[PDB]
Amino acid sequence: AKLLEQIEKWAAETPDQTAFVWRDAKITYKQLKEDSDALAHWISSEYPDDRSPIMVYGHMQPEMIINFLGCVKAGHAYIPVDLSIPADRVQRIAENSGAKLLLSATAVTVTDLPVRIVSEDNLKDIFFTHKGNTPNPEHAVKGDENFYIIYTKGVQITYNCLVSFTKWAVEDFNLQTGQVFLNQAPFSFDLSVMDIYPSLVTGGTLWAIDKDMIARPKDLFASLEQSDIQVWTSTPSFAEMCLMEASFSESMLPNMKTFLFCGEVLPNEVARKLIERFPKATIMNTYGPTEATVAVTGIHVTEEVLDQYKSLPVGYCKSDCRLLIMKEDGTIAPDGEKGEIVIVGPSVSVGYLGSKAFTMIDGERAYKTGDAGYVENGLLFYNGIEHHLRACSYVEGAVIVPILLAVVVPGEHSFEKEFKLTSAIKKELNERLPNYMIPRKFMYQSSIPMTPNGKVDRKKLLSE
């Protein structure tokens, strides 16, 4: 049925089941339906014909999801804005997007925004004032109408784009029903969509972790231990950070069944370690730009895949879409050859809000990713040494950053001086790589730093 119908179905079938939980704050499918219905009814009464996007500001409060649903149920696309987004950027969105309203799941800090701000208590008053009211079914966003706009430039993701992505994920990733889904990515990062919607349409439970938790491993693991998470969606880096914890394995999350990765490169070793620690789980690696609705390719990372590849492939393209590897010139690269990845089909966004990259191919929307890659027998390899670096002795983790800078988290070793560990690693690397490919500069860290979205913090590494 409809995306929204698929969700409300659970409000009827399992009304008391938790739809979302953040620390002590929880909301059941019934509460989600009531409050989002209340919000939507209010939005419609306040804005009779306006259908401008609506900003939803906060971090991990349940009201984030409630607001998302209220906006779309009233025919307005929501624009998620996490607290970690820089104030001037938030302001630029306030002017760029054309939004006239902002709903807050906390205390709005970014002062003076050219938009009507509906704070936390003002938000509670509307859930109360419109309690029991339901929105006009015809107001719900549909077809090629915007559902959400996530900034990267505001990427317009339609109802049809989301549906195309959500059905593929639930079906191909073999998600059940009633499973607990981890949410690590802030909502301002579309990776979050890979868990939010497949969970809501399958009656799962979203277990959100937050910034403060991540900054305190004891807190993070305490939460994970009680989560009973079954479907883990995060960036490779966040999982790698969790793997540094020796107790992060099956015994901690006995019911883990599906790891879903996207956002950056998933190291072969990381995937191998996950497999060793969670023998009952299936690991899925995926790829896609924000402009193609979260992800378009996917592949089950098996022992086989780990063995025949060094850098892991990013998968097979969902069939209602297609990938084209383009050499410099509208000429398609022969299979196996490198070129720019181009995506075409229903997952492709309708374009940047306002305002090169979007085009039309064979009558369908297409997007030039600006990403290099190549395909072999339908298998996509994404290309933006690290694999060989990670495999070296004394290296427990590493990332290569082109300025080439090798950043490595050293494991136990016996070297008294840094330059001696560096020479040893280089000597080892020279065994599998020509000398000119070995990074000149090496830097050591206790751990690879991540941005608030969970990706490798390149900027920070360069600054250091």
Author numbering: 1 to 152, 160 to 362, 368 to 396, 414 to 432, 441 to 501
Paper text:
We also determined the structure of BcDltA in the absence of any substrate. The longest such disordered region is between Arg-397 and Glu-413, which contains the inter-domain hinge residue Asp-399, interacts with β-phosphate of ATP, and forms the pantetheine channel. Asp-399, equivalent to Asp-398 in BsDltA, serves as the hinge residue for domain rotation.
In the first adenylation reaction, D-alanine is converted into DltA-bound D-alanine adenylate (D-Ala-AMP). In the subsequent thiolation reaction, the activated alanyl group in the intermediate is transferred to the thiol group of DltC-linked 4’-phosphopantetheine (DltC-SH). D-alanylation brings in positively charged amino-groups and partially neutralizes the net negative charges of the phosphate groups on the lipoteichoic acid backbone.
